[PDB]
Design a protein around this ligand. Structure first.
Ligand SMILES: Nc1ncnc2c1ncn2[C@@H]1O[C@H](COP(=O)(O)OP(=O)(O)OP(=O)(O)O)[C@@H](O)[C@H]1O
Length: 273
């Protein structure tokens, strides 16, 4: 270790939490939104492998549900797709293009995220929807709200689209707040949707309403979902069961059941025979 270059050690550490566009990198040429992870290894802090040889394909417009126990790497897969971090080997591609080789601005422009909980800013409801694409006009925000199903609700607000919401203003209902996150995604008109499902739930009516809107927004869009809801897993095109960074099994819900493996155990456990 007398021949180690300390500056190079710091450069390597820096590369662990920094993501740079390549010199001369172009825009992603997004076409249908096919997603591929090919043999992906990834570590957050250089101690230990958070994803181990992770390979899968999401064909354009199909849904992929990631399930498995705590700490498996599910959300990690979404963060890597948004290139929050660089991976350590393997490749992530969208429509065949390595995402580490394009401008990260162009990458993210094609990807809409619905996180677990919706962050509301102390600003008008319109600006809160506009957050999904800040360049967007009031006509676009309003159209997004309408497709999110909260336009009529907003029109009834004490100052309509100008009404201050968040902490300092009018309190949105649970359903409304979740439709704002939807409206943002709608406004983005992204080709890929990453959903990370909340572990809290509203009432049955609200959950069914919210799931119905989400499926409208995700239709014809390649979707990856960190799933908590049984209904979301059952309806997916493909399910990865992930344990400790490895995909231990995969298929559609019915094929995982009839496999009688880990997924089938989980399903039997939830049923409670
Ligand atoms: N930024 C980080 N730095 C270091 N470790 C992290 C970081 N983010 C997540 N981890 C750890 O990496 C592992 C994978 O986390 P990930 O968020 O992918 O979990 P998950 O499969 O979505 O399940 P969970 O519901 O437990 O979050 C977890 O043990 C997590 O605590």
């Amino acid at each position: 270790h007398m021949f180690i270059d300390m500056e190079n050690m710091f450069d390597l550490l820096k590369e662990e939490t920094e993501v740079k566009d390549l010199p001369g990198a172009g825009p992603l040429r997004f076409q249908k939104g096919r997603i591929e992870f090919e043999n992906v290894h990834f570590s957050y802090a250089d101690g230990r492998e958070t994803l181990q040889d992770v390979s899968f394909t999401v064909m354009p417009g199909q849904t992929l549900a990631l399930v498995g126990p705590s700490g498996a790497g599910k959300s990690t897969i979404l963060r890597l797709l948004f290139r929050f971090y660089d991976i350590s080997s393997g490749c992530i591609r969208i429509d065949g293009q390595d995402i580490s080789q394009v401008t990260q601005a162009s990458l993210r422009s094609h990807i809409g995220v619905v996180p677990q909980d919706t962050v509301l800013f102390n600003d008008t409801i319109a600006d809160n929807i506009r957050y999904g694409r800040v360049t967007a006009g009031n006509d676009e925000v309003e159209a997004a709200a309408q497709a999110a199903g909260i336009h009529d609700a907003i029109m009834a607000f004490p100052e309509g689209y100008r009404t201050q919401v968040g902490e300092r203003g009018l309190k949105l209902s649970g359903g409304e707040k979740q439709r704002v996150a939807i409206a943002r995604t709608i406004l983005k008109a992204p080709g890929i949707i990453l959903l990370d499902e909340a572990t809290s739930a509203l009432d049955t009516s609200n959950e069914r309403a919210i799931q119905a809107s989400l499926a409208k927004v995700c239709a014809n869009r390649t979707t990856i979902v960190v799933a908590h809801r049984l209904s979301t897993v059952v309806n997916a095109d493909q399910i990865l069961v992930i344990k400790d960074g490895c995909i231990v099994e995969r298929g559609r819900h019915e094929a995982l059941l009839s496999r009688g493996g880990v997924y089938a155990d989980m399903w039997q456990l939830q049923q409670g025979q």
